Amino acid sequence: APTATLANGDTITGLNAIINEAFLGIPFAEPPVGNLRFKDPVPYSGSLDGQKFTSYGPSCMQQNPEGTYEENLPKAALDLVMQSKVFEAVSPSSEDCLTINVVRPPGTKAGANLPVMLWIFGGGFEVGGTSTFPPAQMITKSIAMGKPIIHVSVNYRVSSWGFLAGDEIKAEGSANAGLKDQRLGMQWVADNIAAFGGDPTKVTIFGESAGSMSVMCHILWNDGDNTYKGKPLFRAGIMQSGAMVPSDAVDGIYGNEIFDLLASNAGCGSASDKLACLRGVSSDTLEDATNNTPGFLAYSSLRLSYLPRPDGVNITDDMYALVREGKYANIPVIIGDQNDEGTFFGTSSLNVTTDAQAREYFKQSFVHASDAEIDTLMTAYPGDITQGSPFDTGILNALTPQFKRISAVLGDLGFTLARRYFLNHYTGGTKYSFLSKQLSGLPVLGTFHSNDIVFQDYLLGSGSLIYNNAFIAFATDLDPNTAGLLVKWPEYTSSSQSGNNLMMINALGLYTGKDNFRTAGYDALFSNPPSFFV
Ligand SMILES: *[C@@H]1O[C@H](CO)[C@@H](O[C@@H]2O[C@H](CO)[C@@H](O)[C@H](O)[C@H]2NC(C)=O)[C@H](O)[C@H]1NC(C)=O
Ligand SMILES: *S(=O)(=O)CCCCCCCCCCCC
Ligand SMILES: *S(=O)(=O)CCCCCCCCCCCC
Ligand SMILES: *[C@@H]1O[C@H](CO)[C@@H](O)[C@H](O)[C@H]1NC(C)=O
Ligand SMILES: [Ca+2]
Ligand SMILES: [Ca+2]
């Protein structure tokens, strides 16, 4: 029923979901299999003429989040579930996974020129797929707002498949493959979205957690040059939990350590050219080898095995330096956080219970930090349980004497204070920032990471006003205030500005606040950002 004629004259068919029209599973690149493994994506050559695109394709290979070189119950249990024939059926993955999805309001036609919202999924740069993020809620609300948009989602390679690093990858020019996947998708949107009814000049990119940091990397890509065929690939971006990535170069110490471990795991330890050896192992072997490197829920936690790393070519330097140096696209942006980002991640080191153990965990996590720096971090983030995350919970949630403390650090460095740093330096365009406390009172976790996905794609809640409405108005008019919410959203210029600069969300609704919390931690962490890089 629904139809579109692509740029190359190919005419495809979609699905009429009644409440929207969807074209799912459209291939945008040649399958990154065999010798194309770990390499930049290759534009899709082929004919889609006469093809129907009515279901999501498989996601790229996924990493066991509890994966690790050690052996334990959580790992064994997860692999059990993961390789189960039922899981493989309801949730299929493959190395051939580079597909793109387009979902629009019913009745949309070529030339409608609707604003486009390109979604980049999260998942710690190690798991993830586009199928788990329904556009229906965002789409329906846009229609009801008189501000219809087109939702575009793109599959990208995660884990070893898309973020392998080291000297060989570096020498080959194959760094950040997964980010290049997202980049190609953008180019595809620029070339073909008009046929679906969208306006290529009105693309807003957005993502959550790893997807959010990805948006940041796109702002920083090619020193800020975001053009394609003489025109920018996007007019704005929305960052849901996550700013710059605090990581060393692709051929740094941890990037190389991981590469070597994976190579040994695959049985390529003796190879002169480990990279070509890795291209030759079967998918199974490669999957096994990767699940034997640390996953993000394992003890290593947020000191990720796979993530974006500066390569000196597309991400030319330390990402914090690129922001201080002004090497970014000049676009209006929305960037926010959930109050307790680190509590889910803090559950990974619950065998750390004394300050002595905390000091060593931090020392293991941040190899570049000096003792004095570690001392400052531990003064700035005290053992006092009433000081940790879930914030403002007093003596509650004391899983261990160090849980709330570790959770406070991880969340701040990884997301919340990192956002403040960006905001205090970015002069590219108008800035709007939010902080959600929607789930205050939720035991153990508080307003934890990714809860915004629920209220954006699944359930309706006070937060949806921001996650759908406010985000829709921004994608359409470049100002969230066009949404007509009762609380006006103030522009953010600096964390030192007088007057409220944060949109805030609680269980009942919205209100405004100041982004002046935990200044001691901010300087402990950001006086010299590279001291805390992974
Ligand atoms: C908490 O558990 C972790 C994970 O098992 C311990 O770290 C492992 O310890 C073994 C034995 O010393 C090492 O061979 C592994 O390399 C460690 N794993 C990682 C991922 O580093 C850690 O020592 C425990 N911490 C405490 C304070 O008991
Ligand atoms: S992150 O780990 O990438 C996002 C994880 C979100 C998982 C939520 C788990 C919540 C457990 C309690 C649910 C109560 C309904
Ligand atoms: S999200 O997809 O739920 C989580 C994204 C994790 C990003 C981690 C980036 C590295 C953080 C380093 C500081 C903590 C050691
Ligand atoms: C990466 O950098 C090189 C050098 O600037 C450039 O030719 C190439 O087009 C960039 N790749 C992407 C995907 O932008
Ligand atoms: Ca090596
Ligand atoms: Ca500039």
XYZ file of C-alpha atoms and ligand atoms in Angstrom:
608
model
C 0.000 0.000 0.000
C 2.287 2.926 1.105
C 4.864 3.663 -1.616
C 8.047 5.638 -2.280
C 10.355 6.078 -5.259
C 13.958 6.367 -4.098
C 16.656 8.597 -5.563
C 17.801 5.918 -8.014
C 14.303 5.385 -9.386
C 13.675 2.244 -7.281
C 10.121 2.066 -5.997
C 9.488 0.391 -2.683
C 6.388 -0.569 -0.711
C 5.829 -0.076 3.017
C 3.295 -1.039 5.646
C 0.049 0.717 6.521
C -0.121 0.502 10.311
C -3.323 2.603 10.224
C -1.935 5.128 12.741
C 1.205 5.627 10.642
C 2.948 4.329 7.517
C 6.255 2.526 7.834
C 9.080 1.380 5.581
C 11.142 -0.946 7.780
C 14.367 -2.761 7.053
C 15.702 -0.710 4.101
C 19.387 -1.649 3.448
C 21.650 1.401 3.375
C 25.046 -0.250 3.106
C 26.683 -3.410 1.784
C 26.812 -6.157 4.502
C 29.987 -5.548 6.641
C 30.785 -9.249 6.623
C 33.947 -11.217 5.828
C 36.779 -8.923 4.773
C 34.518 -5.863 5.199
C 34.477 -6.544 8.965
C 35.566 -3.612 11.165
C 35.822 -1.476 7.982
C 33.972 1.724 6.993
C 30.466 1.023 5.637
C 30.141 0.750 1.861
C 27.200 2.489 0.157
C 24.456 0.081 -0.758
C 24.694 -0.960 -4.387
C 21.661 -2.849 -5.648
C 18.031 -2.616 -6.627
C 15.179 -2.343 -4.135
C 12.792 -1.763 -6.983
C 9.621 -3.671 -6.356
C 10.578 -4.640 -2.829
C 8.366 -4.525 0.233
C 9.748 -3.159 3.497
C 7.310 -4.202 6.162
C 9.410 -5.505 9.109
C 12.574 -4.526 11.035
C 15.663 -6.389 9.990
C 17.956 -8.105 12.517
C 20.001 -5.926 14.850
C 23.791 -6.103 14.601
C 25.594 -8.647 16.813
C 25.065 -7.924 20.511
C 27.577 -8.186 23.390
C 26.626 -10.011 26.621
C 26.564 -6.982 28.956
C 27.773 -9.265 31.771
C 30.480 -10.571 29.465
C 34.041 -10.779 30.723
C 37.173 -12.912 30.664
C 36.206 -14.216 34.087
C 33.490 -16.790 34.577
C 30.501 -16.079 36.779
C 26.765 -16.628 37.252
C 25.398 -13.393 35.608
C 27.536 -14.039 32.505
C 26.534 -17.689 32.237
C 22.885 -16.868 32.814
C 22.797 -14.113 30.176
C 24.548 -16.221 27.554
C 22.020 -18.918 28.366
C 19.153 -16.533 27.538
C 20.967 -14.977 24.604
C 21.705 -18.128 22.653
C 18.225 -19.486 23.321
C 16.286 -20.331 20.145
C 13.322 -18.319 21.440
C 15.425 -15.213 21.995
C 17.067 -15.715 18.600
C 13.564 -15.768 17.147
C 11.936 -12.828 18.884
C 15.200 -10.854 18.744
C 17.398 -11.777 15.706
C 20.786 -10.180 15.145
C 23.375 -10.581 12.415
C 26.542 -9.031 11.041
C 24.378 -8.121 8.049
C 22.352 -5.510 9.933
C 22.886 -2.101 8.408
C 19.299 -1.105 7.718
C 17.328 2.107 8.019
C 13.630 2.640 8.978
C 11.248 5.460 7.971
C 7.893 5.948 9.760
C 5.532 8.838 8.940
C 1.976 10.152 9.572
C -0.735 8.471 7.451
C -1.288 10.341 4.197
C 2.194 11.687 3.886
C 3.358 12.213 0.295
C 6.623 13.160 -1.438
C 7.070 16.891 -1.154
C 5.207 17.256 2.166
C 8.511 18.687 3.473
C 7.966 17.541 7.047
C 10.744 18.067 9.615
C 12.691 14.836 10.199
C 13.755 13.340 13.542
C 16.629 10.870 13.215
C 16.902 8.557 16.254
C 20.233 6.968 17.321
C 19.791 4.241 19.955
C 21.713 3.853 23.234
C 23.025 0.676 24.863
C 26.569 1.332 26.073
C 28.058 1.067 22.547
C 27.711 -2.743 23.027
C 24.035 -3.783 22.538
C 21.098 -2.211 20.764
C 18.747 -2.204 17.810
C 16.167 0.117 16.298
C 13.203 -2.214 16.770
C 12.930 -1.532 20.474
C 12.089 2.142 20.032
C 8.502 2.559 18.750
C 7.929 5.903 16.890
C 4.172 5.692 17.139
C 3.925 7.758 20.360
C 6.167 10.517 19.028
C 4.356 10.480 15.685
C 0.816 10.529 17.025
C 1.593 13.399 19.390
C 3.106 15.437 16.526
C -0.066 15.063 14.481
C -2.198 16.152 17.458
C 0.123 19.139 17.830
C -0.322 20.268 14.260
C 3.389 19.623 14.003
C 3.756 16.255 12.205
C 7.265 14.865 11.845
C 8.877 11.871 10.196
C 10.777 9.438 12.409
C 13.974 7.895 10.999
C 16.002 5.271 12.883
C 19.319 3.779 11.890
C 21.026 0.504 12.769
C 24.723 0.767 13.545
C 27.385 -1.773 14.586
C 28.020 -2.009 18.316
C 30.686 -3.733 20.459
C 33.782 -5.256 18.795
C 32.038 -5.222 15.440
C 31.698 -1.459 15.337
C 34.142 -0.073 17.857
C 37.314 -2.171 17.704
C 40.443 -0.032 18.335
C 44.244 -0.352 18.671
C 47.354 0.118 16.482
C 46.206 -1.986 13.555
C 42.738 -0.449 13.336
C 44.420 2.914 13.677
C 46.965 2.201 10.938
C 44.157 0.944 8.721
C 41.923 4.009 9.083
C 39.097 1.865 10.430
C 38.391 3.668 13.727
C 34.781 4.160 14.929
C 33.116 1.979 12.299
C 29.737 2.122 14.071
C 29.759 5.952 14.081
C 30.464 5.866 10.336
C 27.410 3.640 9.975
C 25.287 6.378 11.587
C 27.018 8.923 9.309
C 26.200 7.002 6.114
C 22.591 6.700 7.253
C 22.487 10.500 7.520
C 23.784 10.815 3.998
C 21.068 8.355 2.881
C 18.441 10.508 4.566
C 19.744 13.630 2.798
C 19.494 11.855 -0.600
C 16.198 9.982 -0.177
C 13.992 11.455 2.549
C 12.206 13.836 0.152
C 10.613 10.789 -1.548
C 9.008 9.833 1.786
C 7.713 13.329 2.475
C 10.454 14.762 4.639
C 12.553 17.892 4.203
C 16.289 17.077 4.038
C 17.075 20.593 5.323
C 15.034 20.073 8.499
C 16.745 17.064 10.074
C 17.172 16.958 13.876
C 19.329 14.148 15.266
C 18.629 12.767 18.673
C 19.606 9.892 20.905
C 19.814 8.700 24.480
C 22.872 7.625 26.474
C 25.236 6.071 23.897
C 23.010 7.510 21.214
C 23.362 10.912 22.860
C 27.145 10.783 22.977
C 26.941 9.723 19.320
C 25.068 12.941 18.531
C 27.889 14.797 20.325
C 30.472 13.005 18.215
C 28.501 14.062 15.115
C 28.631 17.676 16.207
C 32.391 17.254 16.597
C 32.978 15.133 13.435
C 35.370 16.553 10.857
C 36.154 19.468 13.163
C 32.590 20.670 12.917
C 32.078 20.301 9.194
C 28.713 18.581 9.033
C 28.045 19.151 5.351
C 27.308 16.716 2.557
C 27.102 17.912 -1.060
C 27.334 21.501 0.189
C 24.594 21.309 2.811
C 24.593 20.417 6.534
C 23.363 16.950 7.420
C 21.277 18.263 10.344
C 19.947 21.572 11.716
C 19.781 20.562 15.389
C 20.364 17.883 17.972
C 18.775 16.602 21.167
C 20.989 14.858 23.659
C 19.185 12.659 26.220
C 21.805 11.777 28.871
C 25.348 12.065 27.545
C 27.757 14.615 26.103
C 31.444 14.226 25.108
C 33.045 10.779 25.534
C 36.090 10.879 27.932
C 38.290 8.504 26.003
C 41.883 8.207 24.841
C 42.946 7.873 21.181
C 42.170 4.709 19.208
C 45.747 3.452 19.626
C 45.877 4.324 23.310
C 46.602 1.899 26.126
C 43.150 0.434 26.800
C 42.170 0.384 23.132
C 45.217 -1.776 22.457
C 44.783 -3.995 25.563
C 41.247 -4.891 24.499
C 42.239 -5.594 20.867
C 44.952 -7.996 22.038
C 42.625 -9.773 24.497
C 39.983 -10.249 21.816
C 42.648 -11.462 19.376
C 43.885 -14.043 21.890
C 40.272 -15.034 22.593
C 39.536 -15.600 18.891
C 42.691 -17.726 18.593
C 44.647 -15.068 16.748
C 47.349 -14.503 19.347
C 50.061 -16.021 17.133
C 49.095 -14.146 13.965
C 51.540 -11.630 12.533
C 48.542 -9.661 11.291
C 45.926 -10.074 13.973
C 43.440 -7.892 12.132
C 43.281 -10.165 9.056
C 43.166 -13.123 11.424
C 40.053 -11.632 13.061
C 38.396 -11.144 9.657
C 38.760 -14.865 9.084
C 37.189 -16.293 12.240
C 33.559 -17.409 12.021
C 30.766 -15.251 13.418
C 30.350 -17.698 16.296
C 34.027 -17.540 17.222
C 34.000 -13.769 16.987
C 30.847 -13.607 19.144
C 32.382 -15.917 21.748
C 35.643 -13.983 21.836
C 33.777 -10.682 22.369
C 31.613 -12.082 25.169
C 34.887 -12.907 26.874
C 35.906 -9.294 26.999
C 34.192 -7.045 29.586
C 30.586 -6.006 29.044
C 29.266 -2.745 30.537
C 27.473 -4.381 33.490
C 30.568 -6.333 34.477
C 32.919 -5.106 37.259
C 34.771 -2.810 34.789
C 31.453 -1.005 34.395
C 31.679 2.269 32.460
C 35.402 1.914 31.653
C 34.109 0.502 28.366
C 35.809 -2.074 26.218
C 34.244 -0.510 23.056
C 33.363 3.158 22.590
C 34.155 6.184 20.366
C 37.806 7.215 20.548
C 39.620 10.167 18.932
C 41.414 8.973 15.777
C 43.199 12.046 14.457
C 41.140 11.943 11.242
C 37.329 12.250 11.806
C 37.457 12.976 15.556
C 40.747 14.892 15.507
C 41.457 15.221 19.207
C 40.396 14.822 22.838
C 36.689 15.650 22.616
C 36.776 18.066 25.569
C 39.581 19.968 23.774
C 37.566 20.119 20.524
C 34.740 21.777 22.522
C 37.113 24.249 24.200
C 38.709 24.851 20.810
C 35.387 25.519 19.060
C 35.630 22.660 16.560
C 31.934 21.863 16.364
C 28.935 22.492 14.154
C 27.008 25.619 14.987
C 23.518 24.408 15.754
C 20.830 24.970 18.389
C 20.733 22.073 20.870
C 18.776 20.517 23.741
C 20.782 18.443 26.212
C 19.521 17.027 29.468
C 19.986 14.328 32.118
C 18.068 12.039 34.441
C 18.849 12.780 38.085
C 20.439 9.432 39.043
C 22.280 8.257 35.892
C 24.871 6.187 37.748
C 22.827 4.043 40.120
C 22.188 1.214 37.665
C 25.872 1.166 36.810
C 26.905 1.285 40.479
C 25.369 -2.155 41.026
C 28.393 -3.634 39.182
C 30.922 -2.999 41.946
C 28.918 -3.984 45.020
C 31.867 -6.009 46.392
C 33.561 -2.675 47.104
C 32.546 -1.712 50.630
C 35.397 0.177 52.326
C 37.002 3.457 51.378
C 40.241 1.584 50.830
C 38.475 -0.544 48.225
C 36.811 2.558 46.669
C 40.214 4.221 46.183
C 41.506 1.166 44.380
C 38.435 0.765 42.191
C 38.799 4.381 41.108
C 42.555 3.883 40.669
C 41.788 0.881 38.405
C 39.150 2.845 36.529
C 41.161 5.968 35.825
C 44.716 4.937 34.996
C 45.844 8.528 34.245
C 44.789 10.014 37.581
C 47.446 10.851 40.153
C 47.031 10.095 43.849
C 46.323 13.743 44.584
C 43.595 13.659 41.923
C 42.135 10.511 43.461
C 42.221 12.240 46.844
C 40.344 15.227 45.518
C 37.747 12.993 43.865
C 37.196 11.246 47.182
C 36.911 14.559 49.069
C 34.570 15.973 46.414
C 32.552 12.694 46.495
C 32.571 11.622 50.194
C 31.591 8.314 51.756
C 28.778 10.070 53.594
C 25.796 8.007 52.344
C 23.456 10.949 52.558
C 25.616 12.578 49.818
C 25.315 9.943 47.137
C 22.973 8.897 44.373
C 19.949 8.349 44.506
C 20.354 11.973 45.504
C 18.375 13.385 48.452
C 17.492 10.004 49.932
C 19.258 10.390 53.245
C 20.268 7.089 54.824
C 18.205 5.019 52.416
C 19.670 2.823 49.654
C 22.779 1.805 51.507
C 23.352 -1.439 49.575
C 26.967 -0.937 50.746
C 28.792 1.992 52.357
C 30.207 2.891 48.900
C 27.269 2.335 46.469
C 25.767 5.808 46.501
C 29.253 7.318 46.275
C 30.417 5.256 43.257
C 27.027 5.892 41.586
C 27.493 9.654 42.140
C 30.910 9.655 40.409
C 29.947 7.457 37.424
C 26.809 9.468 36.703
C 28.564 12.851 36.963
C 31.650 12.028 34.917
C 29.755 9.977 32.402
C 26.784 12.299 31.948
C 25.582 15.139 34.237
C 28.671 17.268 34.939
C 30.029 16.448 31.482
C 26.880 18.156 30.089
C 27.610 21.268 32.212
C 31.145 21.395 30.778
C 29.844 21.335 27.229
C 27.212 23.962 27.966
C 29.765 26.278 29.572
C 31.940 26.178 26.426
C 29.644 25.679 23.446
C 28.851 28.938 21.661
C 27.549 27.257 18.524
C 23.890 28.155 18.877
C 21.049 28.417 21.410
C 21.154 25.952 24.294
C 18.300 24.464 26.326
C 18.888 22.000 29.161
C 16.638 19.812 31.345
C 17.053 17.697 34.490
C 14.467 15.038 35.296
C 13.533 13.974 38.803
C 10.436 12.227 37.525
C 11.142 9.042 39.432
C 12.213 10.467 42.816
C 11.361 7.991 45.551
C 12.028 4.922 43.381
C 14.067 2.602 45.669
C 17.678 1.817 44.835
C 17.681 3.533 41.459
C 15.860 6.856 41.672
C 15.410 8.579 38.298
C 17.805 6.103 36.620
C 19.284 6.051 33.120
C 17.000 5.412 30.137
C 13.736 5.776 32.086
C 13.057 8.571 29.578
C 12.689 5.946 26.814
C 9.606 4.618 28.652
C 7.871 8.030 28.700
C 8.957 8.845 25.159
C 8.074 5.589 23.355
C 5.901 3.498 25.703
C 3.976 5.146 28.544
C 2.541 8.628 28.927
C 3.781 10.621 31.943
C 4.727 14.144 33.074
C 8.025 13.606 31.306
C 6.331 12.957 27.937
C 5.647 16.730 27.784
C 9.366 17.151 27.293
C 10.255 13.847 25.603
C 7.585 14.141 22.904
C 5.965 17.601 22.907
C 8.901 19.883 23.676
C 11.156 17.761 21.431
C 8.635 17.932 18.560
C 8.355 21.770 18.806
C 12.194 22.057 18.734
C 12.538 19.787 15.663
C 9.830 21.907 13.973
C 10.522 25.503 15.072
C 13.956 25.267 16.741
C 12.367 26.444 20.000
C 10.734 24.085 22.522
C 8.518 26.958 23.688
C 6.378 26.646 20.568
C 4.958 23.500 22.270
C 2.790 25.788 24.339
C 3.587 24.262 27.711
C 2.654 26.222 30.834
C 6.244 26.448 32.030
C 8.439 28.578 29.778
C 11.805 26.989 29.047
C 14.686 29.400 29.713
C 17.704 29.502 27.418
C 20.901 28.263 29.032
C 23.963 30.530 28.646
C 26.118 29.480 31.576
C 26.017 27.577 34.874
C 27.063 30.828 36.556
C 24.185 32.814 35.090
C 21.735 34.347 37.549
C 18.227 32.973 37.212
C 16.906 29.498 36.511
C 18.459 27.835 33.494
C 17.106 24.267 33.737
C 13.755 22.788 32.777
C 12.903 20.273 35.495
C 10.447 17.417 35.633
C 8.884 15.846 38.698
C 6.011 13.386 39.083
C 3.402 16.177 38.832
C 4.879 18.252 36.010
C 7.460 20.861 35.072
C 9.205 23.714 36.889
C 12.568 25.462 36.520
C 15.774 25.250 38.546
C 19.477 26.110 38.582
C 22.366 24.009 37.261
C 24.622 24.799 40.229
C 24.785 21.469 42.055
C 28.011 19.633 42.964
C 30.491 22.306 41.919
C 33.208 20.564 43.962
C 32.856 17.421 41.887
C 32.846 19.407 38.639
C 36.245 20.826 39.349
C 37.598 17.600 40.832
C 36.730 16.009 37.475
C 37.226 18.801 35.002
C 40.220 20.832 36.160
C 42.139 18.454 33.903
C 39.686 16.210 32.052
C 42.288 13.794 30.555
C 43.138 12.553 34.054
C 39.816 10.745 34.100
C 39.776 9.342 30.556
C 39.358 5.647 29.756
C 35.356 -7.529 43.068
O 35.150 -8.499 42.007
C 36.001 -8.305 40.852
C 35.541 -9.107 39.645
O 35.660 -10.490 39.848
C 37.379 -8.586 41.318
O 38.272 -8.442 40.205
C 38.804 -9.576 39.582
O 39.710 -10.158 40.477
C 40.467 -11.263 39.952
C 41.281 -11.833 41.150
O 42.054 -10.794 41.768
C 41.356 -10.781 38.743
O 42.104 -11.847 38.096
C 40.416 -10.172 37.704
O 41.203 -9.675 36.635
C 39.537 -9.074 38.334
N 38.547 -8.672 37.357
C 38.517 -7.453 36.839
C 37.388 -7.280 35.833
O 39.310 -6.572 37.165
C 37.741 -7.554 42.416
O 39.009 -7.784 42.933
C 36.762 -7.644 43.531
N 36.974 -6.509 44.371
C 37.023 -6.625 45.697
C 37.241 -5.272 46.414
O 36.920 -7.712 46.290
S 20.917 0.746 30.866
O 21.332 -0.338 31.654
O 21.431 0.824 29.550
C 19.111 0.989 30.889
C 18.570 -0.123 31.736
C 17.100 0.029 32.103
C 16.667 -1.238 32.842
C 15.599 -0.976 33.876
C 15.597 -2.061 34.944
C 14.611 -1.697 36.036
C 14.397 -2.827 37.030
C 13.164 -2.557 37.894
C 11.889 -2.438 37.048
C 10.659 -2.150 37.901
C 9.433 -2.097 37.019
S 23.976 4.309 27.976
O 24.047 3.804 26.651
O 23.027 3.724 28.857
C 25.596 4.284 28.785
C 26.709 4.895 27.950
C 28.032 4.706 28.672
C 29.054 5.697 28.225
C 30.328 5.508 28.992
C 31.395 6.423 28.482
C 32.637 6.278 29.314
C 32.433 6.780 30.718
C 33.769 6.836 31.423
C 33.633 7.372 32.827
C 33.184 6.309 33.778
C 34.361 5.378 34.029
C 37.062 11.164 7.618
O 38.169 12.032 7.365
C 38.742 12.126 6.057
C 39.793 13.279 6.153
O 39.234 14.548 6.520
C 37.670 12.473 4.995
O 38.093 12.306 3.640
C 36.519 11.535 5.158
O 35.533 12.033 4.199
C 35.949 11.489 6.642
N 34.907 10.461 6.792
C 33.629 10.721 7.067
C 32.701 9.506 7.190
O 33.194 11.865 7.219
Ca 49.036 -5.230 20.279
Ca 34.184 26.960 15.012
